[PDB]
């Protein structure tokens, strides 16, 4: 069997999340 | 928070943790800022372990 | 006739924050109207003015990547001696900028 | 195990990835991130 394990992985040259922006009326999500 | 992103990474979770890792349970106390974590005594270290790498201290930055 | 004319407007907002955690600045005006019905009244509002949502991290090397929402907007004034200007008419022009900058 | 049992949940106050799973499934995608996380250049337009 396999034990679990938790990793932490830290990202210098990008974000977690989504952004979020506006075109005058209507939101757009970016993944 | 940080009281969320560990109950949603321990959420279903039927996996052998070293019984399973869907039995572990935590709750976010905000009167002493901590977290309240019951499980076995191998499953409270290893989630004792995984706190101090996300505690961390931060910089400051000032935008103009 | 024989006009000349020249003028000069240097703004400066300043907000402080930490990484990884949006901070917001805001500096508005509202313009409240009666809308006179007789079911769902309300007071409508307008608002405008400078506005900043930062997102700051930094990189490897030591550089500051940040993630701006920037609105600067102002009140535009038509003709004072026309009936216009004593109603719900402040025609806002604004300026919105939003990008990401390392 | 399986691919349908590793959990990944974005802890946004650090800037950085939760993943649970084995062993082999944890470093399975430390390799993925190194490869999607490359520094990006500028454009100005005009």
Redesign the interface.
């Known amino acids: 069997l396999g034990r679990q394990k938790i990793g932490v992985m830290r990202l210098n040259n990008t974000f977690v999340g989504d952004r979020t922006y506006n075109l005058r009326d209507q939101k757009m999500v970016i993944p | 928070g940080i009281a969320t992103a560990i109950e949603r990474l321990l959420q279903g979770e039927e996996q052998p943790l070293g019984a399973a890792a869907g039995n572990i349970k935590i709750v976010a106390y905000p009167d002493t800022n901590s977290l309240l974590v019951k499980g076995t005594a191998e499953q409270v270290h290893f989630i004792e372990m995984l706190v101090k790498a996300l505690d961390v201290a931060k910089r400051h930055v000032e935008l103009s | 006739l024989e006009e000349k004319k020249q003028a000069t407007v240097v703004s400066?907002?300043?907000?402080?924050?930490?990484?990884?955690?949006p901070a917001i600045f805001d500096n508005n005006r509202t313009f409240y109207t009666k809308l006179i019905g007789e079911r769902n009244v309300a007071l409508e509002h307008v608002t405008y003015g400078t506005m900043?949502r930062?997102?700051?991290?930094?990189?490897?090397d030591g550089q500051?990547e940040?993630?701006l929402?920037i609105e600067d907007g102002n009140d535009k004034t038509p003709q004072s001696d026309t009936t216009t200007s004593v109603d719900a008419l402040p025609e806002v022009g604004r300026t919105?900028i939003?990008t990401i900058?390392?």
């Open positions: 400066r907002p300043v907000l402080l924050t930490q990484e990884n955690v900043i930062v997102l700051p991290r930094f990189s490897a500051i940040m993630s929402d919105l939003s900058a390392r």
